[PDB]
């Protein structure tokens, strides 16, 4: 079982990638036990990044670790192809792409052709990044099998039979769940792990839940699962993608800069209110020894 972090992209106030803050974040994540870093995903604002910014994120994180899955997708296939080819110089786990977003009513033929083109040029294993609520399209287990060239899939959806279908129809595929419910997906249900949004700011929890689950300490893991869930709930008050910056700095102790508008940073009063909502949770996790004070 593996935990994969869809890593946040920190931006400066000039709205450029803060390479040094991203280096520090990646270091802390690997040191806290995260298995792999997924770069240019939804949580890292991948669609908000130009192709060159996506590449910059790869380089920054690669200085720290090879354990990278490099998201390269977009609405210009030639750009996605170019990023796939540029990745040949990086000894990483894989590249990935979401399905073409925005456009409604795209044919399965065209969607399949998009992914097969990336497979044909990829110097690395190719991962499906399946996120129907964001992209408007579902590349399900059957379509993945038609595509035939994925080494793995990240199924960002709460429909757990949907995720298990990839394993059933593609037995050699690595299958990761993007469900908020780590306890039921990380271990012991036929999947290879979880892509965990909350691991950016509380990697100790996600990793500890993983261990507890494999040791059969379900009651103990559920308690942390619930704390994790209460943080997620709180992150939605002002917007999860923006709140992830405030929460990471609060729980981990280092700044991550700003998101990219229109993912607007929380202002000082919203940050204050959000910290107030999660301060009791942090005290509990300290009392439990998952976080050092």
């Amino acid at each position: 079982p593996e935990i994969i972090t869809p890593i946040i992209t920190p931006f400066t106030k000039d709205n450029r990638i803060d390479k040094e803050k991203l280096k520090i974040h990646a270091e802390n994540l690997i040191r806290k036990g995260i298995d792999k870093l997924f770069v240019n995903g939804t949580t890292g604002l991948g669609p908000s990044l130009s192709p060159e910014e996506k590449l910059e994120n790869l380089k920054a994180v690669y200085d720290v670790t090879n354990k990278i899955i490099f998201q390269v997708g977009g609405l210009n296939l030639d750009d996605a192809i170019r990023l796939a080819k540029l990745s040949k110089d990086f000894d990483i786990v894989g590249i990935a792409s979401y399905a073409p977003y925005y456009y409604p009513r795209m044919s399965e033929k065209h969607l399949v052709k998009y992914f097969k083109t990336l497979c044909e040029v990829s110097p690395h294993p190719v991962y499906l990044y399946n996120y129907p609520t964001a992209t408007g399209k579902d590349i399900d287990a059957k379509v993945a099998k038609e595509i035939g060239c994925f080494t793995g899939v990240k199924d960002v959806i709460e429909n757990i039979i949907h995720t298990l279908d990839y394993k059933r129809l593609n037995p050699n595929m690595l299958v990761y769940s993007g469900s908020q419910m780590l306890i039921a997906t990380v271990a012991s249900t036929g999947l290879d792990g979880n892509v965990a949004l909350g691991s950016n700011y509380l990697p100790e929890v996600t990793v500890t839940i993983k261990k507890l689950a494999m040791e059969r300490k379900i009651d103990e893991a559920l308690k942390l699962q619930f704390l994790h869930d209460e943080v997620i709930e709180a992150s939605r008050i002002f917007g999860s993608l923006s709140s992830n910056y405030v929460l990471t700095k609060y729980f981990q102790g280092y700044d991550l800069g700003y998101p990219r508008p229109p993912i607007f940073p929380l202002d000082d009063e919203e940050e204050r209110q959000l910290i107030k909502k999660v301060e009791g949770i942090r005290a509990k996790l300290v009392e439990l020894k998952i976080l050092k004070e």
Copy 2:
């Protein structure tokens, strides 16, 4: 943890409840180790039954077992109240209701009032039957807490965190998943069991999966899960509610009559083609000694 069967309602050719076939079905499921029978649920065509017929279903199954949850809901609250009160003289597990179906844009106030009304008159513990896809409404963990009188919930939805939420916010509530993925909901994930529609025609498979999972035999349980999912898949070819009758006759060896139109029965040709699709699953299940030839 438990397996609850949303039990099929057998109808005769002239569209009457076939009480003797219902009793045979109920006995078989109890004999094979189903824990409770959920009567007048979706799989039993509850919404197609008059309140008179819902009570007759209760009376038929009660001649077999008192391990009954009695679904009484509908769009005439007085009829639901009457069914609840009439259940007084049955030593059963509880009553249940789905949310008011059909009408869109019902206020939360009215939804809460409907359910509190049933609690006030019920002589038994009351179960929430949550099925957003069929009813158009979600009675989520927060709304259930506001209602405040549910002994348990059956959450018929693939969203596994949605189901867990009930336990986090209502720690004394019994929480059952209606997910197709037995292996992640029947044990060791914080839940009390699974309401399994496939358990009508393959109770042995669902009961055995519950055991293998408790015993941590995930590989062996996974193999049965996939076979169960293949049958499920096959049932969608002509319609699951209709097909569940053909499948139960095929896998369990007794006739369950007809569904109620507009849930039309499969014709002779459709039956033959469906059997064709699952005869190899049957054969595999025999070799595994899950079923007898």
Copy 3:
């Protein structure tokens, strides 16, 4: 072109149909220029009614007028058949049915078979009552052509091209939009009229909008359309099916009793708040000489 009123069903405090209030209501609507009365529709709480209650509505309104479309649908096809046959003794415009509701993933074949079965037994022209938000299913122009036997369709959907499609694919079909926008649907855009929710409580407004629209007095018609839309939005604050009762009493001056729970009646405070939100609209309609002081 025609205005069709989906007529309210008044109930007594004992939750039985109030025949005398229904007769009074139907009389007023005909007197005010409504062309036809659609009985046991959504606004009449058709799905909350037993087969015998649906028949009682037909009978009460038929004492007043034969300009009736009689909705008979349900999840027990024998009951629908029985109602269709019982309508023979009533010289009305036609019978109608919505698609089978609640049950998801019903096959097109079964949906077609339901409607063709009703056509086979109907002594009258058969109308499609298409309401996909309420039923979960869409019987679109193509499926309607396949069914082959509809004299007309009431398409309750805001998607105006979807409604015109019925005319394009079935040139002999009478086609009525259920859209809130009377101006663009009631006349001069290809359709035969509008099934108008608001017509229960402001029949004068919908008739006058039709006349002005036919006269091409668009500015005048829009002013009324906007006052009508404001009443619609007020009706949704507490639930439009419940507010329809208060609004009919307020604007038409007679009582329509109660809805049937779980369509709960507005409580005293809600009634007061709803009146406050429309009492200026009333004043303006009086000033404009659409309503009587």
Copy 4:
């Protein structure tokens, strides 16, 4: 009332904007009676275009006409700001943005701030481009009023009351419908016109339907509307965004090149199949003297 064409972006075989083909297309659209050209819209593959390409599109079309609405939106608000400011030296109708796409559960506050930031920097009127099925978010009349700085709205949605709401709550706002039903939106129902995808390839049909509708020749208008609808239906066979290129070349007589993958071009077989679908429509339009042979 006005017709606005969301103009196609022609690309070369090597995926570069083909400026000369764009100019030829814009010239023909203006010549055939189209009032305004909307550049970098959905039909023009705006989200597939870099900010540099969005500007190049403006520059090409501006050599032909200054009746341009310049779509500038994106997920890097600095790029949108830059494009807005660069537009100062062009005497155009306005700029436009869709809502921030892809990311789900964006707060209203952040959506409002996005649009207000554009208004604060815009040297021109600002248009709301409302396209909820593509963007995942609806900026409805009420939020539009709260944003408070739009000169006009393009409501790409078939819900016609939704579109009218903008005019009701914002009387000075220009309100265009993107619905497929020209005859009910272009004239005489309260709106200022229609943004018509089909106007790229059959501008003659779009302009004549408007003329007929204004003249109140509804039967003649409706007959063209149906022909238009049959082409749109044929364009869905292989994908509308791709089929618009083939249809423009077929009906208008000049090459528009290729779309940008993953909006893949129709291959030679698909083009022939689609032409066979519409050649009867073309001959009919020649017979009606809408098109010259």
